[PDB]
Structure 1
Amino acid sequence: TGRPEWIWLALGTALMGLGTLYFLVKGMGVSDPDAKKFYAITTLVPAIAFTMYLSMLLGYGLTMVPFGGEQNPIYWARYADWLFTTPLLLLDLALLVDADQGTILALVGADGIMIGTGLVGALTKVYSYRFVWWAISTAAMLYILYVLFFGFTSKAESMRPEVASTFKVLRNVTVVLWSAYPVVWLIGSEGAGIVPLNIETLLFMVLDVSAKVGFGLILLRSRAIFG
């Protein structure tokens, strides 16, 4: 089919793959128990992204949805990725600052709601109702971010300096990167249809690699993950 976005799906496959392999090799060599947990979680993240990026490349996870008088291409496979990857990233953050079980449950619950409503949105046929689901999803996201910013940061300042400092970086990457997703969806093929699907994929590829491989590099190279 040779769809124009394929190139970025192919580069995302390769970046996710390499990052998975690198983290696996590095994880395999660690014996510290606490470090191992971070390695497992953090290797699985780009691994999942890899599979989803590869699938999309090979033309799975793509469906046509009718709205605004057109058949719009929607990659639902991203949601299958983010369903598991986003809460895993939150888990890494939560274990870093030793967050309470209840906070974790709430964050993972809110995250499910973000991704589930984002997907309903993406698949909705009434143009205006697409944006209602988008709004509910953005809300859930903002809850998350609030918690990371106000709750976790506060928790991190009881910890050793390298733990507080590593957390702040990861928190800052997370806030900046995550906050861009809803904007992309809004202006792109799922929303207003302004940014073309080729460029939108580029944007999501950049954000995904940054949010998983970038995040992962900073986390796993830090001294904070040793118990």
Structure 2
Amino acid sequence: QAGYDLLGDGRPETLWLGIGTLLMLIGTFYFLVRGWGVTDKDAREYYAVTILVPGIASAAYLSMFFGIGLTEVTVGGEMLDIYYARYADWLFTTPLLLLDLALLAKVDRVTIGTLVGVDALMIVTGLIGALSHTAIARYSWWLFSTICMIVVLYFLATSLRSAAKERGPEVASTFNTLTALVLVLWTAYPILWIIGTEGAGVVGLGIETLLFMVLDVTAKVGFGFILLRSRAILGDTEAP
């Protein structure tokens, strides 16, 4: 695969996992240090949620770097690598990101339950797809997971956006900037999966790991940077 076998264990993709580790740790430490001077009760909740997003990803990237949680899946005459930590990362961090958006929009706990329940189903079915042993199952679960993603994004774009609007310009501008980011970045994930090693196999694991790493850093550290610099996080929140 495209990269460089840093640890001398036959995995050129560790180059990208190492860089990803470093960027996630630096982002975590930046937000943490910026958080220590924050007193407002709402801002503290946003910081707490948001620090954990690159924080948990840091742990997942480090695990992947060292080869912890790596195994192979047999698909006919081919053995696909799967890093379990990647899915565990997304299972925890995607609800956290949605929770940030739901706090901005100030929506009810039933709406949040729906959003995060569909998000969890998306990640689980993606994992089932990655572990499946025939191409028909892989594409099927991928499609299922993708329809779940559209439902999440549809809710962000319609119901949560409408709610944020009622909260005035500071909140609605921040909500709309972040939602613009999410709609684009999150859609990139199923596209990479299907053209990469898990699907059609056009790109190999090296390029795939690199691109997931860029997406992950943008979706976590980039998102965090946009949110935490906004005056909107000082406004009232109601936790679920």
Find the partner of 1:171 among 176, 179, 202. Answer: 179
- Residue 44 of structure 1: how far off its partner (Å): 0.4
Q: Give the alignment of 1:1-227 within 5 angstroms.
A: 1-227=9-235
Aligned equivalents of 2:81, 2:41: Cα separation in 1: 45
- Residue 69 of structure 1: how far off its partner (Å): 1.6
Corresponding residue number in structure 1 for 2:4: none
Q: How many residues of Structure 1 are paired with residues of Structure 2 in the alignment?
A: 227
What amino acid maps onto 2:47 in structure 1? Answer: Y
What amino acid maps onto 1:36 in structure 2? Answer: R
Aligned equivalents of 1:95, 1:74: Cα separation in 2: 34
Paired residue secondary structure (1:125): coil
- Residue 27 of structure 1: how far off its partner (Å): 1.1
What amino acid maps onto 1:74 in structure 2? Answer: I
Q: What whole-Å deviation, never above 9, does each CA across 1:158-179 have from its counterpart, x for those lacking one?
A: 0120110000010011111000
Q: What whole-Å deviation, never above 9, does each CA across 1:157-209 have from its counterpart, x for those lacking one?
A: 10120110000010011111000000100010111111110000111001000
- Residue 62 of structure 1: how far off its partner (Å): 1.5
Q: What whole-Å deviation, never above 9, does each CA across 1:35-60 have from its counterpart, x for those lacking one?
A: 00000000000000000000000001
**Range that drifts further, 61-70 or 144-153:** 61-70
- Residue 63 of structure 1: how far off its partner (Å): 1.2
**Range that drifts further, 43-52 or 56-65:** 56-65
- Residue 68 of structure 1: how far off its partner (Å): 4.2
What amino acid maps onto 1:62 in structure 2? Answer: L
**Range that drifts further, 61-70 or 137-146:** 61-70
Aligned equivalents of 1:222, 1:191: Cα separation in 2: 39
Aligned equivalents of 1:69, 1:90: Cα separation in 2: 39
Aligned equivalents of 1:112, 1:172: Cα separation in 2: 22
Aligned equivalents of 2:69, 2:36: Cα separation in 1: 32
Conserved 8 A contact 1:76-1:122: no
Q: What whole-Å deviation, never above 9, does each CA across 1:134-163 have from its counterpart, x for those lacking one?
A: 111101100000000011111111012011
Aligned equivalents of 2:62, 2:68: Cα separation in 1: 9
Conserved 8 A contact 1:166-1:222: yes
- Residue 76 of structure 1: how far off its partner (Å): 2.1
- Residue 61 of structure 1: how far off its partner (Å): 2.3
What amino acid maps onto 2:229 in structure 1? Answer: R
Aligned equivalents of 1:177, 1:76: Cα separation in 2: 22
Aligned equivalents of 1:121, 1:162: Cα separation in 2: 41
TM-score (norm 1): 0.98
Paired residue secondary structure (2:80): strand
